[PDB]
Amino acid sequence: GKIQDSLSSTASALGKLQDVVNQNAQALNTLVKQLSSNFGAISSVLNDI
Amino acid sequence: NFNFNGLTGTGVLTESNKKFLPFQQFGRDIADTTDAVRDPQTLEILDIT
Ligand SMILES: *[C@@H]1O[C@H](CO)[C@@H](O)[C@H](O)[C@H]1NC(C)=O
C-alpha cells in the first residue's frame, strides 16, 4: 500500500517510459522541422522554386 | 489548393473555434507547420488540415 503513495508523491518514478516517449517525439519533431531547411537552395518551398 | 496572401499549400479548410489576434494572420503548431490561416477578407479563422 505504501508504494502507491510513493508513486503518487514522486514524479520521476516513470523516467524510462517518459524519456523514451520524449526522445521519440523530439526526433519526429526535428525530422518535421528539417523540411524548413534549404540545404543551400535559394528557397525551402517547392512552389517557390 | 489554397494561396492565402502568398502562402501556398494544400488542405481542407474548416471553421476554427480558436480566434487569432487582430494583427496575427497565419497560425502554426509546435512542428512549425501551418495549422490555421485568417481569411484576408472575412477575417475568420480557417483550420487547415
Ligand atoms: C471586403 O468586402 C466585403 C463586402 O464587400 C466585406 O464583407 C468584408 O468585411 C471586407 N473585408 C475587409 C478586410 O475589408
Swiss-Prot record, chain A:
Coiled coil location: 18-49
Region (Heptad repeat 1): 1-39
Role: Subunit of the fusion protein that is processed upon entry into the host cell. Mediates fusion of the virion and cellular membranes by functioning as a class I viral fusion protein. Contains a viral fusion peptide that is unmasked after S2 cleavage. This cleavage can occur at the cell membrane by host TMPRSS2 or during endocytosis by host CSTL. In either case, this triggers an extensive and irreversible conformational change that leads to fusion of the viral envelope with the cellular cytoplasmic membrane, releasing viral genomic RNA into the host cell cytoplasm.
Protein name: Spike protein S2'
Organism this protein belongs to: Severe acute respiratory syndrome coronavirus 2
Record note on what altering residue 38 to K does: In strain: Omicron/BA.1, Omicron/BA.2, Omicron/BA.2.12.1, Omicron/BA.2.75, Omicron/BA.4, Omicron/BA.5, Omicron/BQ.1.1, Omicron/XBB.1.5, Omicron/EG.5.1
